[PDB]
Amino acid sequence: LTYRIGNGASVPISNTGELIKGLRNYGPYEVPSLKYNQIALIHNNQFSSLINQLKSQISSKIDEVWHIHNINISEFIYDSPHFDSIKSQVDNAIDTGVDGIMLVLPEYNTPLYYKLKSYLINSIPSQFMRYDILTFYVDNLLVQFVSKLGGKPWILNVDPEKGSDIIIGTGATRIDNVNLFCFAMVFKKDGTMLWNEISPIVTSSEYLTYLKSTIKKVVYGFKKSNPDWDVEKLTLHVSGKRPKMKDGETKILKETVEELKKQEMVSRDVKYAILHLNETHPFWVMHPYEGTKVKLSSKRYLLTLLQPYLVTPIKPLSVEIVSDNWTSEEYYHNVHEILDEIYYLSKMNWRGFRSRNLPVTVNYPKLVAGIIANVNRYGGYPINPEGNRSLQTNPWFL
Numbered sequence: 001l002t003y004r005i006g007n008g009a010s011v012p013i014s015n016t017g018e019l020i021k022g023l024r025n026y027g028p029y030e031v032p033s034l035k036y037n038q039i040a041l042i043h044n045n046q047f048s049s050l051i052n053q054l055k056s057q058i059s060s061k062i063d064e065v066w067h068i069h070n071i072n073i074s075e076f077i078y079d080s081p082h083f084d085s086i087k088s089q090v091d092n093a094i095d096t097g098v099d100g101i102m103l104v105l106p107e108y109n110t111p112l113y114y115k116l117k118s119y120l121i122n123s124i125p126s127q128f129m130r131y132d133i134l135t136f137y138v139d140n141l142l143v144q145f146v147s148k149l150g151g152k153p154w155i156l157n158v159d160p161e162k163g164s165d166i167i168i169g170t171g172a173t174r175i176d177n178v179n180l181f182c183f184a185m186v187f188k189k190d191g192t193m194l195w196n197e198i199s200p201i202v203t204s205s206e207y208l209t210y211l212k213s214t215i216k217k218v219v220y221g222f223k224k225s226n227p228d229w230d231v232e233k234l235t236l237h238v239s240g241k242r243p244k245m246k247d248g249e250t251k252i253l254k255e256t257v258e259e260l261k262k263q264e265m266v267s268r269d270v271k272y273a274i275l276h277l278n279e280t281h282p283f284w285v286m287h288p289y290e291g292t293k294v295k296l297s298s299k300r301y302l303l304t305l306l307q308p309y310l311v312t313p314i315k316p317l318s319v320e321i322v323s324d325n326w327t328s329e330e331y332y333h334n335v336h337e338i339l340d341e342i343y344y345l346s347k348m349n350w351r352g353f354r355s356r357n358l359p360v361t362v363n364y365p366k367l368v369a370g371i372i373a374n375v376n377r378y379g380g381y382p383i384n385p386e387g388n389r390s391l392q393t394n395p396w397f398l
């Protein structure tokens with residue numbers, strides 16, 4: 001129903017004009033805390049007035065829409081559109097002292113893009129742009145960049161009583177027929193990602209081993225940084241193209257929760273549920289058909305999510321409850337609440353102003369996968385969160 005932005009203001013969902021106007025008037029929910037108040041804009045020798053207009057827009061909107069004041073945007077020039085030339089300027093900018101880097105790259109070199117993407121992600125918050133593609137575009141890229149800098153554009157308005165529930169988005173994505181990586185991301189009910197971990201790429205044979213370890217790792221991260229946050233209610237949203245190990249995976253996830261209760265990481269009497277979330281085949285109804293929940297069986301539901309970016313086109317999301325420790329009496333109420341929360345989470349996407357209409361707990365892992373899959377395909381540097389608090393706690397994948 002509404003997004004909360006700055007100064008206690010909220011705006012209706014589903015209206016980007018109102019959201020941008022809201023941000024102009026009130027600011028984002030949380031302006032990032034910067035160290036240098038300096039951003040590098042890195043580009044080539046060409047298109048002077050295009051880049052000047054771009055720089056002017058970035059500067060204007062960072063100030064007026066995002067309420068980040070007194071930012072210096074410094075410029076760095078690369079001389080040829082090749083890895084070595086661009087990275088030198090990237091390195092020089094890092095050495096000057098910058099909070100992040102906005103990098104403009106040529107249209108037609110996809111392996112280069114992913115090589116640099118992996119370099120930057122491992123180094124410093126960054127925003128990539130392409131010469132060939134303005135106010136709409138710049139608007140959207142700033143939502144991502146502000147988030148990467150640690151800002152919170154807007155959050156979902158949820159009940160304060162549920163303020164401390166956590167949702168873990170977890171599962172794996174296959175890179176190919178044999179290799180995959182697992183993920184585990186901790187979210188607040190308001191849709192903010194607190195912590196993210198990814199396993200190394202491993203074979204399918206190792207999936208369950210690394211699934212448990214990745215979940216345990218993200219919860220460790222989160223608990224070490226939030227030691228007085230009691231996890232009394234926990235939901236797992238499992239997704240991804242992953243080894244079809246039904247009972248086995250559910251056994252291991254159930255064990256993972258039980259083990260965390262032992263590391264005293266969640267409360268000894270946590271109420272939890274483990275849900276499988278899957279996009280199913282689209283359909284077209286020839287705002288009734290929307291936050292609509294369809295029960296298929298005691299354990300299986302569909303949410304009729306609207307197709308994003310404008311018959312009503314539905315992109316249904318299947319929701320199956322595979323395990324929970326609720327009482328049979330609690331089950332009706334909990335079901336309704338979990339489905340409602342999933343619906344709300346479908347309105348959270350800091351990729352841009354327009355809702356993705358897929359729950360953030362499923363979508364953000366998909367974004368991670370697109371990057372990892374392409375870095376691996378194009379022979380970029382592995383995304384390596386090891387020793388990077390910035391990576392584990394910021395949405396680098398937007």
Ligand SMILES: [Cl-]
Nearest residue numbers: 077088089092
């Ligand atoms: Cl130079």
Ligand SMILES: [Cl-]
Nearest residue numbers: 076089092093
């Ligand atoms: Cl330089």
Ligand SMILES: [Cl-]
Nearest residue numbers: 126127128398
């Ligand atoms: Cl980007």
Ligand SMILES: [Cl-]
Nearest residue numbers: 141144351398
């Ligand atoms: Cl993007």
Ligand code: NI
Nearest residue numbers: 063064069070
């Ligand atoms: Ni100003």
Ligand code: NI
Nearest residue numbers: 091092094095
């Ligand atoms: Ni250096």
Ligand code: NI
Nearest residue numbers: 232267268269
């Ligand atoms: Ni308790």
Ligand code: NI
Nearest residue numbers: 276277278320
């Ligand atoms: Ni399933």
Ligand code: NI
Nearest residue numbers: 336337339340
């Ligand atoms: Ni409801």
